[PDB]
């Protein structure tokens, strides 16, 4: 029993974190086989952050302008290139701790673990969802760029996020590991704003199912709704529309609890219209949308 925001064990990723420095700019890099991946923002100076031309900045550097450190062991850079917003620094040493891995691009509503790092050193691990507006609500200070987000399946690490920047609302924006930003953001210190966000409905439903599996049943009712009637209420409360694809992925949780997806949608509708009346669900007074259906199953009993 119990239900917590649970990260994947970070061991396989800790062994990949390096420090990359250019002049006085430092951030983190990810060392896989003989390549170090990092935000291209590392080649910027304090003066070239408003409108940098990264192609220019890169031609003006050579391999020796990149100091890469795996702990104190200095790694010799033997090649460099730029792919979208990330740099690939070829090094003379292949990382002996490289896990089985892949690079994946995740969708809004999916979750992952963040290993927050400073100066190449892991400092903490936490769970994050990719919001519908393509930001994450992370915990990042200056020096954290290059920290990565990941999922683990068996012993295969799927890297999905590299940290770049913080937006004015305090939320965070970054790239996939091919260097493409999630969302309509760019790696420059210009005025940029997260689009309006919405609540991930399928995840709130997953989490109500987690609550039932754990014994919270006070919010259930004998009513059911149509998908269409439910989506009218979702639109009014700024929740994402629920699709038949979402209903189908809630299938296993619905079967295990014996509560039909549209029966649980009638519960959610009541919770949206009336609130909780001083009660809590799984220790929260708010409806939680950062657990996927997969996160519930992974963590809950069957």
């Amino acid at each position: 029993s119990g239900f917590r925001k649970m990260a994947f064990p970070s061991g396989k990723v800790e062994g990949c974190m390096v420090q990359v420095t250019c002049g006085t700019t430092t951030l983190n890099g990810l060392w896989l086989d003989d390549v170090v991946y990092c935000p291209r923002a590392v080649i910027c100076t304090s003066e070239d952050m408003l409108n940098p031309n990264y192609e220019d900045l890169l031609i003006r550097k050579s391999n020796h302008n990149f100091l890469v450190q795996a702990g104190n062991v200095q790694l010799r850079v033997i090649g460099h290139s730029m792919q979208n917003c990330v740099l690939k620094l070829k090094v003379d040493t292949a990382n002996p701790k490289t896990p089985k891995y892949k690079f994946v691009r995740i969708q809004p509503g999916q979750t992952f673990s963040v290993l927050a790092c400073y100066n190449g050193s892991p400092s903490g691990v936490y769970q994050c969802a990719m919001r519908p507006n393509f930001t994450i609500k992370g915990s990042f200070l200056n020096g954290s760029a290059g920290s990565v987000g990941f999922n683990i399946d068996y012993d295969c690490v799927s890297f999905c996020y590299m940290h770049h920047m913080e937006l004015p609302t305090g939320v965070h924006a970054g790239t996939d590991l091919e260097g493409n930003f999630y969302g309509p953001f760019v790696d420059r210190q210009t005025a940029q704003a997260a689009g309006t966000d919405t609540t991930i409905t399928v995840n709130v439903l997953a989490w109500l199912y987690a609550a039932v599996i754990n014994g919270d049943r006070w919010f259930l009712n004998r009513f059911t709704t149509t998908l269409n009637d439910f989506n009218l209420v979702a639109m009014k409360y700024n929740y994402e529309p629920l699709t038949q694809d979402h209903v189908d992925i809630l299938g296993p949780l619905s079967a295990q609890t014996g509560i039909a997806v549209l029966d649980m949608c009638a519960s959610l509708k009541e919770l949206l219209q009336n609130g909780m009346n001083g009660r809590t669900i799984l220790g929260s007074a708010l409806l939680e949308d950062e657990f996927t259906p997969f996160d519930v199953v992974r963590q809950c009993s069957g």
Binding site: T25, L27, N142, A145, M165, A173
Partner: peptide, 11 residues
């Protein structure tokens, strides 16, 4: 505000 590229400073 503007975005902040969260690189750090060193020496």
């Amino acid at each position: 505000t503007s975005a902040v590229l969260q690189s750090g400073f060193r020496k």
